[PDB]
Amino acid sequence: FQAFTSGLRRYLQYYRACVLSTPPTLSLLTIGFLFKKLGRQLRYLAELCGVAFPTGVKLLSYLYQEALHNCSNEHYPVLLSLLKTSCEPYTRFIHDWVYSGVFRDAYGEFMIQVKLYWTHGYVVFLKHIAHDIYVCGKTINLLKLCVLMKRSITAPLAAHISL
Amino acid sequence: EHLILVSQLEQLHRQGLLSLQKLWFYIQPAMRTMDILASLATSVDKGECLGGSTLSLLHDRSFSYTGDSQAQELCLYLTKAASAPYFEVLEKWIYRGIIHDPYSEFMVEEHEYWDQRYTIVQQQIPSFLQKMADKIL
Structure with a gap:
């Protein structure tokens, strides 16, 4: 949620950059027409947020379903640039079981938490790789011992994974 | 580099091309850089850091900006420069046994049957060598 808040x-700032740039003093009607194709987009961002709100994977997947729902329209880049950075920290967690194997957790945003030794409970993105990540890590955590x-x-x- | 960005303006102002509203735009980057250096110079003054603890701070104040990219390319220029002197004695303690460290700041200090000669100091650990704080000694 912080990264998505940091991506917003x-x-x-770009919206603050576009304003105070072009018009020194233009016609009154010019303002209303110029800020229409852009202003309505600002009101759309109110439907997205609250102005409850999911967190963790529940949010990283909710924002995804907002893409296919409104893909081809002019709202594709802005949502994409958010999703492209709203998943940045989550990749790092995924970048642990693949390279180092040191599971990192803070508040539970990860879908996975922590003789038999195999009690790391597990239970959107393609499930063809979901269950594979769960085993691609436990092997590394087993070779460490x-x-x-x-x-x-x-x-x-x-x-x-194959290597 | 800030004494030049005020030189270019004192020359561009002679020609009359510098209205007050125009100033409030040009200094925008020099208002954000001088707001990082005035926050590291505050932590160092408030909390006595010298040696290692003044290198742990520059590895955490550089991770907190893991999404700015305009104040992380900076705090990564300070750490990469405020750690060469610390790393030039480390290249004397690993490849040889001599420890110069005139000011008591290195992580390992000697003494005057051998578990008391060299002792790991806990304060002056850079918190990014914490994983290998043992293989060094």
Whole structure:
């Protein structure tokens, strides 16, 4: 939620950048027409947030379903640039069981928390890789004691799972 | 580099091209950089850091800005420069046994049958060598 909150301010400043830039003193009617194709988009961002609100994976997936729901329209880049940075910290967690194996948790945003030794309870993104990540980590933790095409994630990932 | 950004304005103002409303735009980056250096110079004054603890702070004040990219390319220039002198004695303690450290700041201090000669000091650990605080000694 912080990153998504940190991604939003990366946008408002642009909205503050566009204003106070072009018009020194223009016609009154020019203001209403100029800020129409952009103003209505600002009111759309109120439907997205509250002005409750999910957190963790529940939010990283809720924002995803807002893409396909309104894909081809002019709201594709702005939502994408949010999702592209609202998932930045979550990849790092995923970037643990794949490279280092040191599970990192703070408040439970991860879908997975922590003789038999296999009691790391587990139970949107393609489930074809969901269950695989759960086992791709426990192996490392065991050796230590001895269009929406998601290709930018699985491609640098599946190459390391088989090895 | 801030004494130049005020030199370019004292020359561009002679020609009359610098209205007050125009100033409030040009200094926007120099108002954000001088607001990081005035926050590290505050923690150091308030909390006595010298040696390692003044290098732990510059590894946490650089992780808190893990999404700014305009105040992380800065705090990564300070840490990368305020740690060469600390890392030039470390290259004398790993590749050889001599510890110069005139000011008592290094993580390892010697003494005058061998578990008391060299002792790890707990304060002066950079908190990014904490994982290998033992293999160094």
